[PDB]
Amino acid sequence: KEMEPLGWIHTQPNESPQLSPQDVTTHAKIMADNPSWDGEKTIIITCSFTPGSCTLTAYKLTPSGYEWGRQNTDKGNNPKGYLPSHYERVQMLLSDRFLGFFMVPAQSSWN
Amino acid sequence: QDAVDYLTWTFLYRRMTQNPNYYNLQGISHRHLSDHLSELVEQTLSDLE
Amino acid sequence: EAKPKFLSKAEREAEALKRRQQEVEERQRMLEEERKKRKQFQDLGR
């Protein structure tokens, strides 16, 4: 309750140079369903397992992408109306100066 | 009030401004310090009565 | 200020009630501001 939601972070089997239609539609659906998810502060962090490394990239959803995701219903890899103008890259960096923590379900596990 | 003034002399009162959490305190602010002193003195007086 | 005054329990609890009312008022105000910002984003994207 003292922190403001900032989005979600998810893994990727291999690096890609763009935000996927699946990720954008999921983000838009979550934002539409939940009012607390402001579209200007939330982001998507993609961790891609590149050869012997993890590459992290941050993406932000523009209003056009928000509308397209909230309206879309196709879960295929190449839905209609998805354009590179729907998302933009936001600056993200690491830090050794403070520590964050985790929160897992009570009765069960996560996976 | 004179009880609180009397407490303002004890070494305890000095440490309730540098190490408050030791004494169940939640802040070095004047409000917090006065409230804790009042609670402690009231509790002791009630028990004595 | 410097000298710590004594406060009765009734006064202390009244002050605590006033403080909690203040913070809930400020929470409602911030929620309304968030609603305004969300409307601005929605009608900018719309």
How many Å apart are CA A35 and CA A16, to the nearest integer? 30
Nearest residue of C to residue A31, measured between CA atoms:
C38
DSSP string, B12-41: HHHHTTTS-GGGT----SHHHHHHHHHHHH
Documented resolution in Å: 3.2
Write out chain C residues lying below 8 Å of A35, CB-based.
34-35, 38
Distances in Å between the Cα of A11 and the Cα atoms of A21, A44, A49, B33, C31 are 15, 11, 8, 49, 32
Nearest residue of C to residue B38, measured between CA atoms:
C6
Q: Which of the 8 DSSP states describes residue A43?
A: E
Query: Experimental method used, please?
Result: cryo-EM
How many Å apart are CA B5 and CA A104, to the nearest integer? 50
Q: Contact at 8 Å (CB) between B37 and B25?
A: no
